[PDB]
Amino acid sequence: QNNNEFKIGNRSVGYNHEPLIICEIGINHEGSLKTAFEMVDAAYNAGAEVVKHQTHIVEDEMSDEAKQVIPGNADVSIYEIMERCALNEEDEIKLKEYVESKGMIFISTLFSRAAALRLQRMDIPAYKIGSGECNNYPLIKLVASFGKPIILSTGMNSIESIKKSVEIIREAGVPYALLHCTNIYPTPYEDVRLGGMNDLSEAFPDAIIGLSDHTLDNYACLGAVALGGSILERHFTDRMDRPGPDIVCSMNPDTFKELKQGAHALKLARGGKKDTIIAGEKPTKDFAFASVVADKDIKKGELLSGDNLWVKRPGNGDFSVNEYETLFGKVAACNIRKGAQIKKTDIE
Amino acid sequence: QNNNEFKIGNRSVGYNHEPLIICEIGINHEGSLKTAFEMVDAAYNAGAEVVKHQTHIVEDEMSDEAKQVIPGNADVSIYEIMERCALNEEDEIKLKEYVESKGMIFISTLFSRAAALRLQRMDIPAYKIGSGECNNYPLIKLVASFGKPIILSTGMNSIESIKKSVEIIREAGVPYALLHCTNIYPTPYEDVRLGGMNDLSEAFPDAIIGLSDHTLDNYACLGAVALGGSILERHFTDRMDRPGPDIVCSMNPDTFKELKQGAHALKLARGGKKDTIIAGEKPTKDFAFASVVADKDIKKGELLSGDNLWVKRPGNGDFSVNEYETLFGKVAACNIRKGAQIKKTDIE
Ligand SMILES: CC(=O)N[C@@H]([C@@H](O)[C@H](O)[C@H](O)CO)[C@@H](O)C[C@@H](OP(=O)(O)O)C(=O)O
Ligand SMILES: CC(=O)N[C@@H]([C@@H](O)[C@H](O)[C@H](O)CO)[C@@H](O)C[C@@H](OP(=O)(O)O)C(=O)O
Ligand SMILES: [Mn+2]
Ligand SMILES: [Mn+2]
């Protein structure tokens, strides 16, 4: 597909690299460090490489209008949800340290200037911009100025809209990924449109391409790997019985382990070319391909024809089935036995 | 992707149709009808739509040379394997009837003229040509003359080689599918090259495209569905403890059920376009997108600027973040409160 790559800390991402699964803890901790650490533990023990947070600072990310508006996956205002779930700066610094103490990478999504600046003080190795902020060009400008790679989700946005964000990122000269995404919690399979990933790669040839997903299972992400995706994001929980608006579409340790295994298999299986010769098929080719044989007894001097020739396994005859018609009209140099392979010496 | 379709009996296959899984019993019955019927039962109970056989007639498909040649997945000659596993005509007619008695479709692969003619007497609704016969042009001509759709596997063959077979099929005027395939039993993930499917569709725009697979699990076939595959073939057994050269790469009832579920999900998720507007995202767009707000108290008569304006959720403000820069240089028509959304009435 392509050779685009960049590093998130010491981890290379790109088509020629192992896909990267981002375990999005997000707001799943419901504002509790005990719960957050239990989820980091679970991620670690499952084999995760990256844990992503959401950095919410209620007053800088929302005006008072947000106290009147309810998201699709809750029955209270988005302001109330964020007031309940948001970690303060001190606590989020502890979370980052904890994630790093487990040898994993910590990144986060910012939803405001104040959050961008907080994350820069913490010096995270890459910045996630959520689909809601994909068209937030002032915020994109700010984050791109930080000098680190950007992972940009592109739900709810057209190629045209995304173009302006990519323009800002390139000007700042940082590498970037684009994740195709659909922001319904949860998302039905029919709304995923994996082909959206192809649209993105075509429009933005220098982007690393992946999928951020909110379906109920791993199928969409697995398809994404097959199509060439390099980054996969699902929300993550230690257990599915947890409360919270995003828990329903979250993976857990077991399903994370499944995705990691599948992603590895599909990283190996994907791409390549039809005409590539595969050495291990040789024993099959040698028995399975056909050679030209006599379909009847043929007397010396008689002409070979489609009437007295046919083809049979295996492939070690002097004449391959590919050469069948070329023997038509040749002259038997000797008597030929029905069922025998036609030999070079059997023809004049 | 495309709108190519044809029917196998009453079952439509093509990109706009549910993918079709072919349960390849092949030689797995080791020549026993009891075992074959146990495998048909298992297929039926698992939810299979199609059971495929292999029609082996040892004397017409192989010359005596085959008694000296061993396949990659056995330690005895291919002749001995086929003598052991081949069902005679009477028995194969019983198998077909049994499959049809369970409401499933019966098809088979021929490896010889005699087998083609046997299958035509049985009037099967579509003919499978295995990868070994993909370059067997005389046999392809014969089968195409029968007037039924052809499913052609293309392992071990280049686009160039396949072209000659497609030419023969088109001349006969029957619809056809091409299955990408790698013929190692089993096949490592790295040798699958799913991109081979794209190569085929590009080269042969009128073909229905699928995958015939010999890996140890469902990952390759799932990837194939994501890429647009319409037909999936794996060998099938009622249980994995059975003896035989192809058992190791076979699916069983449980894994068939998994593939069917995955294929359905990925049929729904695949393709589509990035720019398609998804109604269910609307509640997310309404809270997540930003509007322009005052970043400081602005006195009446003062000029709006990037210094006193910023952006915040939610998206119901008079000015979207998209319009942010257009307010620069406008004149406050009244005092504006820090944190308030900029209203149309706030500017001259
Ligand atoms: C529109 C939005 O901000 N959605 C939140 C989501 O977790 C909400 O905070 C939650 O569902 C509110 O109920 C995340 O899905 C956003 C997420 O990015 P993506 O899902 O757009 O890839 C991120 O990087 O934080
Ligand atoms: C080269 C060949 O004929 N391989 C056999 C296979 O089952 C052998 O009979 C078996 O492995 C011999 O040990 C099948 O895989 C062929 C199979 O087609 P495909 O695997 O090329 O799609 C078919 O349609 O019958
Ligand atoms: Mn998300
Ligand atoms: Mn096969």
Structural overview:
The PDB classes it as transferase. The entry lists the keywords neub, inhibitor, TIM barrel, sialic acid synthase, transferase. The structure is a homodimer of 348-residue chains. Chain A is α/β, with parallel strands linked by helices and 348 residues long. Chain A has 2 domains: 271 residues, TIM Barrel (Alpha-Beta Barrel); 73 residues, Type Iii Antifreeze Protein Isoform Hplc 12. Chain A is 32% helix and 16% strand. An 8-stranded parallel beta barrel of chain A has the order 3-4-5-6-7-8-9-10, surrounded by 8 helices. A two-stranded antiparallel sheet of chain A has the order 1-2. In chain A, helix 9 links the parallel strand 9 and strand 10. In chain A, helix 1 packs parallel to helix 10, helix 6 runs parallel beside helix 7 and helix 9 runs parallel beside helix 10. At the A-B interface, helix 6, helix 8, helix 9, helix 10 and helix 11 of A face helix 6, helix 8, helix 9, helix 10 and helix 11 of B.
Radius of gyration of chain A: 30 Å
Q: What form of chain A results from the Cα inertia axes?
A: elongated
The quaternary state of the protein chains shown equals homodimer
The main sheet of chain A orders its strands as 3-4-5-6-7-8-9-10
- Outline the biggest β-sheet of chain A: 8 strands, parallel, barrel
What is the CATH first-level class name of the largest domain in chain A? Alpha Beta
Keywords (chains A, B): Metal-binding
Pfam family, one (chains A, B): NeuB
GO molecular function (chains A, B): metal ion binding; N-acylneuraminate-9-phosphate synthase activity
Domain AFP-like (chains A, B): 291-348
